[PDB]
Design a protein around this ligand. Structure first.
Ligand SMILES: Nc1nc2c(ncn2[C@@H]2O[C@H](COP(=O)(O)OP(=O)(O)NP(=O)(O)O)[C@@H](O)[C@H]2O)c(=O)[nH]1
Ligand SMILES: Fc1ccc(Cn2c(N3CCNCC3)nc3ccc(Cl)cc32)cc1Cl
Ligand SMILES: [Mg+2]
Ligand code: NA
Lengths: 167, 469, 166
């Protein structure tokens, strides 16, 4: 019946990347989570009037298993490439994540979105103009999200689904 | 009737339970949240022991209480005032008779002695299983030694004297089996000839056995201190999670070595022999329940340089295709079949650690440190229980040793494996991908021929073990 | 995976902890550190079925004798351990047997009688005397050595089987 989209979250560790999927899949209005629960990473949603199922792979915490990235990325139809807006290194990592996705998927046009994540109150070091310019150079959308207020979270995932639908 | 308690003014752990200080989950109660005072009261409760709470608490408490403060609180818990004589006792004493002291004797037997013994059990578990607090804070250790060494009175004496000795042993700090381990197997490389050791010259059975011993030892060395607080992801990860990182880096190095062995074998026939040998090693990993090793192989075969080698895949024997496919299926659907298989096998095993890491991280990130109730902030203990359920599972698989003999030279060979050399990661993985493109070019470029590189027989000895008398 | 709650009881020093640690870790503990209460978990396949053993290791010292009801309520089966070179520990068995029956309000509690330290030559409790007691309880008798592993798996896994058939 309904379409299932396999989405993969990628990006540097240690800077709050996991908050994006947790806040999406969460009981939006109760701050609670058991990731061990069968289908704590599947969510039925309605995007532009069309019901679909999101299956989200977020291997947050496994970043040091660098030789597994190809295997994990291969499972995805669309990718959220996430950096922290107060961690310049995580932003500089984005280019290599995108190159690796293109290689694994053997395509120069893989559905993906760039996500700038605000994970704390430490001072921002990546300005939105820098990230917009990077996203434009790649031809992909840019979404900024808060790891605490859920702002931008739906927009990030729904924008990616639209990129898949319009591929 | 219930025993009367000290006044909560002189002994803080006698305050009544209320939703302002403790919340239970919906035959001992399970705590959802509470003040630190209430958590310590229930950690050392007079009515029952809760050894899984002791482990949970001692594994996770540093997220809400400093080690120095925990020790102060359990010493306060230990120092329980005795009740005054009752009216009947008073009347006996006024007549020159010995009082019965029934209420005093009951309070000693049913409140003081169980609480004090359970405080000592916290101390014993703390020293035996979480000694890193004392290694990192010498003054904390001094305070613990002084507390234990000044407990008076005969009811606790056996355990006080024991805990003193345990502490002294921990400051300056053998396996038996149902059967003999199997004989070490040799192929082209013979014992002592380490210079010839390689993927195809060692026996594939013994490659899998020695990697399993190595990977089991790495798995067994990871302590919960390297996991709680998600410290392996933070800036001080090399300080706080060294055994975990060593384990992961071994896994990464072996995966990269498998990829390098494959793509640097440019002759197609030889490369088929290399991949077939790796799948045989995977078969023995499966037989040994070394799931880390299984996924090391699967990760290599799904890497960008190897996955695209259609001409190699075509020549792999059908039975080996099926072995590799069923290993790959363990990881599908968020490791559904892996998780079921891990929970069904008979240990020893070597779990894949990455799932535990993701679940600990997401449990930490996805649940609040405190719950706000009736204007009070209560420690969210349910969150810590969930983390300790994961660390408890990890520990359960760390207990069982493999009945396999170490071969010191083969062990050293795999300990010293360094496929990347002095190259940086991007450099090296680009090299592997460029080799893949060289040996099997993208269509419609023609497939070239390449000379053989191995001078010894490529035929595998197989992976069924042999047994001479 | 079925979960089984096993409890190891008996007089101080008979080897309850050594038996448990041998089962869990394949290691023999030479030290005598009196237990307050310890708990262990073990996944193991028994008669083709995977289960999870929760093993409670209890205090044998008499100073803890008033704290037993709480663990006897939780346990589903009991290893009743004495040492075959300690006649007093054998005489203490019946007190544990009777307390378990009272707490669980049952004449039919899964139990195994264990005579530990069978690696030692200087026996003072004869096998026949222990076997007679076991028959009077309707339970098996298994001699063990936490030092050599003799009988250790048999004792624990026999208790699992009696919980499974209960
Ligand atoms: N020779 C031999 N010694 C054993 C055996 N089992 C235990 N011991 C020894 O007996 C002593 C007491 O063992 P332990 O396991 O601590 O006994 P326990 O019954 O747990 N004591 P407690 O009730 O105080 O916790 C230790 O020195 C231990 O090495 C055994 O099978 N053989
Ligand atoms: F020699 C090899 C070379 C490449 C592969 C990659 N690969 C394939 N390929 C099928 C043919 N088209 C490319 C994908 N199916 C697989 C199933 C499971 C796993 Cl883990 C890897 C897999 C495997 C071998 Cl055996
Ligand atoms: Mg003991
Ligand atoms: Na920065």
């Amino acid at each position: 019946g309904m379409t299932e989209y396999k989405l993969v979250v990628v990006g540097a560790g240690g800077v709050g990347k996991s908050a994006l999927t947790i806040q999406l899949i969460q009981n939006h209005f109760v701050d609670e989570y058991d990731p061990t629960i069968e289908d704590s990473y599947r969510k039925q949603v309605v995007i532009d009037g069309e019901t679909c199922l999101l299956d989200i792979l977020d291997t947050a915490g496994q970043e040091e298993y660098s030789a597994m990235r190809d295997q994990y990325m291969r499972t995805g139809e669309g990718f959220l490439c996430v950096f922290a807006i107060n961690n310049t290194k995580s932003f500089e990592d984005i280019h290599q994540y995108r190159e690796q996705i293109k290689r694994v998927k053997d395509s120069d046009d893989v559905p993906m979105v760039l996500v700038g994540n605000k994970c704390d109150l430490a001072a921002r070091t990546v300005e939105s103009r820098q990230a917009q310019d990077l996203a434009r150079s790649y031809g992909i959308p840019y979404i900024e999200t808060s790891a605490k207020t859920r702002q931008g979270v739906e927009d990030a995932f729904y924008t990616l689904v639209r990129e898949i639908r319009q591929h | 009737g219930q025993m009367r308690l000290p006044s909560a003014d002189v002994y803080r752990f006698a305050e009544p339970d209320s939703e302002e200080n403790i919340i239970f989950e919906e035959g001992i109660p399970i705590i959802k949240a509470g003040t630190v005072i209430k958590l310590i009261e229930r950690l050392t409760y007079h009515m029952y022991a809760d050894p899984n709470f002791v482990r949970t608490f001692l594994t996770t408490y540093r997220s809400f209480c400093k080690p120095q403060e925990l020790l102060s609180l359990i010493i306060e818990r230990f120092e329980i005032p005795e009740p005054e004589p009752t009216e009947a006792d008073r009347i006996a004493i006024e007549n020159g008779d010995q009082p019965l002291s029934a209420e005093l004797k009951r309070f000693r037997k049913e409140y003081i002695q169980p609480v004090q013994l359970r405080v000592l059990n916290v101390c014993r578990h703390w020293v035996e299983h979480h000694f890193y607090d004392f290694e990192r804070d010498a003054y904390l250790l001094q305070r613990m030694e002084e507390f234990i060494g000044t407990v008076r009175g005969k009811a606790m004496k056996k355990w006080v004297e024991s805990i003193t000795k345990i502490i002294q042993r921990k400051k300056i700090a053998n396996i038996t089996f149902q059967s003999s381990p199997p004989t070490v197997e040799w192929h082209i490389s013979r014992p002592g000839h380490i210079e010839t050791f390689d993927l195809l010259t060692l026996h594939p059975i013994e490659i899998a056995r020695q990697l399993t011993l190595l990977e089991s030892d790495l798995y067994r060395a990871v302590q919960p201190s390297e996991l709680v607080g998600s410290v392996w992801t933070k800036e001080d990860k090399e300080i706080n999670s060294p055994n975990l990182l060593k384990m992961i880096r071994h896994t990464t190095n072996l995966t990269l070595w498998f990829e390098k062995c494959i793509v640097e074998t440019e002759n197609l026939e030889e490369r088929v022999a290399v991949v077939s040998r790796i799948i045989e090693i995977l078969q023995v990993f499966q037989e040994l329940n070394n799931f880390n090793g299984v996924l090391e192989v699967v990760s290599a075969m799904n890497s960008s340089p190897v996955y695209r080698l259609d001409h190699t895949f075509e020549q792999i024997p059908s039975r080996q295709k099926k072995i590799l496919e069923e290993a790959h299926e363990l990881s599908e659907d968020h490791y559904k079949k892996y998780l079921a298989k891990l929970r069904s096998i008979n240990p020893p095993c070597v779990p894949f650690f990455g799932i535990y890491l993701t679940n600990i991280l997401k449990t930490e990130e996805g649940n609040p440190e405190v719950l706000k109730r009736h204007g009070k902030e209560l420690i969210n203990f349910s969150k810590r229980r969930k983390v300790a359920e994961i660390t408890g599972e990890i520990q359960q698989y760390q207990n069982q040793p493999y009945c396999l003999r170490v071969e010191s030279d083969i062990k050293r060979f795999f300990e010293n494996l360094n496929p990347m050399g002095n190259s940086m990661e991007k450099e090296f993985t680009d090299y592997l991908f460029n080799k893949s493109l060289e040996i099997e070019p993208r269509n419609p470029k023609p497939l070239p021929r390449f000379p053989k590189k191995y001078s010894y027989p490529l035929k595998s000895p197989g992976v069924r073990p042999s047994n001479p008398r």
